Amino acid sequence: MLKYIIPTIMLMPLTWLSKNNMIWVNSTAHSLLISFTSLLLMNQFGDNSLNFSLLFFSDSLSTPLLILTMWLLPLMLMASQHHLSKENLTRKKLFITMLISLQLFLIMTFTAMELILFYILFEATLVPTLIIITRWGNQTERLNAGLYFLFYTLAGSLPLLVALIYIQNTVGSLNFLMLQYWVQPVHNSWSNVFMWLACMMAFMVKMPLYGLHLWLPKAHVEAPIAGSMVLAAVLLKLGGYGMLRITLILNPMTDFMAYPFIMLSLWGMIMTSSICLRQTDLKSLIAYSSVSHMALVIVAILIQTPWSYMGATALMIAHGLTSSMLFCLANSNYERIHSRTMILARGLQTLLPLMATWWLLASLTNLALPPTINLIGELFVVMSTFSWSNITIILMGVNMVITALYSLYMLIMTQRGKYTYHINNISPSFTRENALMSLHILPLLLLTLNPKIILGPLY
Amino acid sequence: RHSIFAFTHVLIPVWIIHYYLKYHVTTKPYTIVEKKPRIFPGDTILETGEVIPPMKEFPDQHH
Amino acid sequence: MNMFSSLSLVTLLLLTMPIMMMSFNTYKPSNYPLYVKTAISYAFITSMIPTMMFIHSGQELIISNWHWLTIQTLKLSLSFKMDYFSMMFIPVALFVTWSIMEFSMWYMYSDPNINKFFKYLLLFLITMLILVTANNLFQLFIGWEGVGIMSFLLIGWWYGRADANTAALQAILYNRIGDIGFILAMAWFLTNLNTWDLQQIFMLNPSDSNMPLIGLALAATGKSAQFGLHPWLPSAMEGPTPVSALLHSSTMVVAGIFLLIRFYPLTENNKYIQSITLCLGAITTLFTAMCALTQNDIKKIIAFSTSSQLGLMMVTIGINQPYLAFLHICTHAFFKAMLFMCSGSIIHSLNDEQDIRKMGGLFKAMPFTTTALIVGSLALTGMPFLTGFYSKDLIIEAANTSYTNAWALLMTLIATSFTAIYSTRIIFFALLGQPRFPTLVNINENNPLLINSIKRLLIGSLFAGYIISNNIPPTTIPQMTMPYYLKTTALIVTILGFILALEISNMTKNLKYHYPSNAFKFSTLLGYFPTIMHRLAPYMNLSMSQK
Amino acid sequence: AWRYMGGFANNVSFVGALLKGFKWGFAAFVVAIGAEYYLESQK
Amino acid sequence: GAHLARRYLGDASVEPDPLRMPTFPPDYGFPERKEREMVATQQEMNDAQLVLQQRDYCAHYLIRFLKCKRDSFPNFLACKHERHDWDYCEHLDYVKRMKEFERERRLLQRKKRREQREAD
Amino acid sequence: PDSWDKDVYPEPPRRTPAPSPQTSLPNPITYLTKAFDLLVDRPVTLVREFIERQHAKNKYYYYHREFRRVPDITECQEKDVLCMFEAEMQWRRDYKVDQEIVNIIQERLKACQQREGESHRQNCAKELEQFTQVVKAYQDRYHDLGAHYSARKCLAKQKQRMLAERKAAKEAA
Amino acid sequence: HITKDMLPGPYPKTPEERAAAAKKYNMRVEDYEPYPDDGTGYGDYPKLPDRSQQERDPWYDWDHPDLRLNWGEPMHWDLDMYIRNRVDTSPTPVNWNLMCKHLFGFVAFMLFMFWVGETYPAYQPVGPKQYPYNNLYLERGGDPNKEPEPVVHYEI
Amino acid sequence: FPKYEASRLSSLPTTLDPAEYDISSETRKAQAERLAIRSRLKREYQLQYYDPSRRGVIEDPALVRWTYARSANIYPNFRPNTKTSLLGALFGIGPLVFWYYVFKTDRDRKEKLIQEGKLDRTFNISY
């Protein structure tokens, strides 16, 4: 992994020591090269994972999340340089440093071989994430929403620490490979029930689960484009990746301790998909789409079947590329009309022909048009939850019907109709904006030709 | 014009599909599975020169 | 085998190449529509060659060239099935599309996105041949949802109009409600059997298959616009008339039936479903035809003609006659495409007027269009020895002489009568009587493209049924012995329908005021299903959302 | 007035249109059965 | 079916049951019955791949038909003569079914009268 | 694909009727068949020979990996990771192979269904018979283990089956 | 850069507040009326009539044509639900209940009629069809080893 | 000919509206008043709309209020409101309870059959 950590570290000396005008060209061109060498992580074997050292390994579940992570950094530089053109150079370089710092923690987070090393790097990510979202965030609106952290830390990160520490004193190790061969059944007990919640609540909030989701729409409204791209694409997946790993040592308690959460997710899919219909802000509509999609991932993880785990891994990767593409498309308008209201600008397909095409592809993959990996993931989750209980096809079916409605309602409102007469600043799309969309949807469509790489370690 | 169409958009595509089907798809098990031909009474088999027995004599209806 | 397998796939690859040359190359813009029309021209001839081989010796293929994905003990391949249903349908669909691609060159000449329109027409055709040739259920879904999108994109072709955008979203909403049934079948087969391939499904033949068949039937209820999910097919006439001819009347709507014709091996054993499909078809054929009488827009009437026929296909499925419904699909495509194409000539000549009330006196001003408008209308009702006769007549014979639901048997015949009433209303109001259109006369149909397109499908509406019925191999034990009245019940009700219709038309001439009858208002407003359901449901779902 | 005069005045009835071309149709038909009659007569 | 009114509107026991028929042993009134004969061997029908529902007593004609057509390609009007044979053979087959229906109908009435007069 | 081993992927002998044209009209398919052979079959066949001649010029070989059997989880001491790791990787390989066995027996069942046409319900009893046995064996081996399946869980399921099977045998006597 | 006072505020509880509110929303005081004061969260937003945009005259020269709104005009709370594409409330030719009753009668009646047909089927007067070789026992997939119950079909 | 019976989704036509028939000085002033406000707004917008030098967005203050009011957090509402907040409590934890027994019982029944062999899973290989 050092082959990736080190060159990612060397991006900070690169940014600081570059010509003042060539920071974006260097950082984007060299953050792109790092991603190219990240295709070496697909040296996967059928029986055994790819273990590099005592600290870091890479199995089929982390390989895509690592390649997605390093693919996103060059995209987040292209997305952000336009609205950072005003501000001075030293403040400009720090913004790039925070993004390079975030990648470095994320590549170590997905590959950490020990759970405390994962936990520490799992919380260290929030440090760059919060600086980006609050210092460069477009919103100074004053939320007082730190109570969502006070709720998170008190109810999430702290119990995860006490449980992980408790487990090591008992099992003797937190090496993931060791837990595969040393895990023991979790007997029913009021003490074990608290261990189960401690090991999962931290990840449920980040997904986020229904009921704990209200932080996500607020965070997306504040964050700059870079904050939302990393937040929707990856940081939501840290909870998903965390639950896939940690459910190994929670059996068989997951059989009966997962009923309350599945009922939140299954019913959560319908509630948030319906709320999308009535949304007035793009970023909130896209933010509520994420909660509706991640609700499948939570159900897939908790029913723990070989098909569901393949489904969750495809959804996590597919959702990441799609949602970040939608966030960028929403930002392209905001960089014009300078508002996040959906109704403000309409009929934009009359003035921006090619951009309307990108909107169409992004919407199609969000509503899950076969054979996109957006449906390969969703179909597998639907197949397995059917076995879990045939009734779930009712809730799964309705969520497909609503999902097509806000997917296309978003398309119809912003791209169809009569253009708003008074808006006269819809300049033609830049090559930066078209290249940025093409780098979300060309990889996303090409993955359909070889879908095995994203189907996880259960493949 | 039709000749330029036919050569580029029919003849060349069918060479590719024939090269592909004959030397890549048919060289793997069960790729192309065809329903066995209908064998009627009083027919001749190419492989074995066999002759199927004729049917019984019909009840000689008025026909 | 060599020729059958190779040329079965040149058709599919031949259609894609025009799509490929849009993304790359730059040899010929400006002349794209004729470039596309030739692809279908050639793809048809190449598609006949396998069809002749199938007729000669009943040869059938499965081609699984590519291995795409192996989900443990589930292997997904790009499998094409070139059997009875694929071989017959493809030439019919290509032949119908051939003329429409030529009728669109004229009907859509001024529109500057003509090249984009032809790209979408072709992209639908590609997703329809995928649907019919598919050999496994997953590949069937690509076509199933592929057509569903291409409806949205084409229905809302004029995206400035607010009704066009509403009609497009309505098409998606009803189909995706039906596609809940499709996934339910997909989940059931994988869970209880072990494949999405059709071969393994028929080999195992589950005895208890009530759940998967309800799911399959539900997909047909939404895709083919049966009762309960039918409002979208009328409202989907908002697109350009070539779209309504090629998609929402000739082909795409049959895919709902085509799904049940695929699964006859299972539905034949399951009586409990046969009743549902019979009942489901019985109501839709009556209801839509009942609504067809009082409509005033030529596109809308022909739209309900499609729904009423499609229900007759659904009844054929129920009475356990799957191979007839397939014949009805093929024969139905010819004359229903010709009707729309002819109604396209009227609308284009009268300066975008769809109301038959303002049409008339065209019987002499538009000879060619009028001749076809008669030939097509006669096929639908059941004129002996026309394309429509070879399919509709047998369907009525098999319904009358089979163990069936009494009410369903009766509704079919009543709807067949109604099929006569609104076959005339198009003729009487649009072709007969003194003219009623605005003063300035520009009625001109002297163009080779519109004529050649209409001429070709006119021949199909005459001889296509006779050729197809004779050539296709026998597949069931047809019933040819029955009481005389049941034998000619179809013709009598058709004749009795005409008599009542002509009398009604004449009463319209008489100078007597108009009197509102509840039966009349229920007919015109489509039973109030569109009004109640497109107001109560959107209101509740949108309003419940905030809570 | 223009709707009821000038050539628009004469419009056939429902039956008339249905029977459009019958006169040529019958002529071809009657001759047709003759050919099969005669051609069969010559064996 | 005018007969239907007889069953549902009219008396029930007299009219046959379309599903439970027949309800009398074959020879109760038919001394010396001749077993129906199948011309086509099981192997032949299987080799012809005839649809199962078409594997009935009239097969031998149907087999002959298809053989003609496959030979008569590309002419599709050639095999009319065979077509009639199979079609008529079904017509006779259908008639036998009608006789089976009436034989049930007559017996049911005959049973009704016999027991009624005795019950009187 | 040296050539699908006929034993593994069997196909019954082909019986095709000979051409017996009674009618006098020409048969287009016979004409097209010759035109196809000249226009398509040969120019393609020449290309494959040109490629094949050069392929045989440079010939290099690849081999099929052999894995020694190693002690199963039944011989591994509790918590002895190095023994469990050998046992666990081996079991995963066999779990993967046994999946491709079911597919092969599935591919047969699907080939027979198409080949036997309308008589398939009778002429595929052996193929359906074999498919049901492999499925039952697979179901008992590997069904219900879960997403975190392992050799230890496969062993526990087997040991549960044998106890219930063993107990049942007693009750009969 | 918009002022805080010109943004929605808490529910008005005194007429002076109401006068301030009505002015804030570009509305005459008489028209203005806030929602009932509960926790629903409408604040002081005007409670405009629940009518769809489809009602408004299409022939006026609106600022936003497709929406049929006027710049600065107060916007209905549920405006997005009432855009032309969505819920439509135009006056109907028939009474709402009458449409419901007729439709309920049509659908409900037919279902019972289909129930009746099932109870009393319709069929031709012919005996059940007969098949050779023990009803095609071997061709229906029966076990070759097990022997069926012999069946005999006699001429008639 | 019964009058039109209005409903929420069936508006009462203006032509049959009882009020519109009689417009007095009071009504006439109001409509003139409304037109006055409407007229003034049209003027403010049109100056910016027709201004040659404007290349931007004529920010509509009414729109901003609509978005702000819709996108509200916690500034309204009181926690222990029985008539409304409790009705919110039912609509939230209500459906989650219903689906609990809908899925708990079903998986109980299936497991019991599987524990008795009654359930048929002859080819159930993928889970």
Ligand SMILES: C[C@H](CCC(=O)O)[C@H]1CC[C@H]2[C@@H]3[C@H](O)C[C@@H]4C[C@H](O)CC[C@]4(C)[C@H]3C[C@H](O)[C@]12C
């Ligand atoms: C192959 C050739 C490129 C060389 C050139 O520029 O002349 C290009 C140029 C214009 C093309 C033609 C045009 O696209 C349309 C022609 C008319 C018919 O549609 C048949 C195909 C048709 C005949 C095409 C075949 C081929 O693609 C052509 C002929």
Ligand SMILES: *C(=O)CCCCCCCCCCCCC
């Ligand atoms: C069955 O579907 C048709 C019922 C129609 C009534 C016919 C009554 C008239 C014929 C009576 C004498 C002929 C004997 C069948």
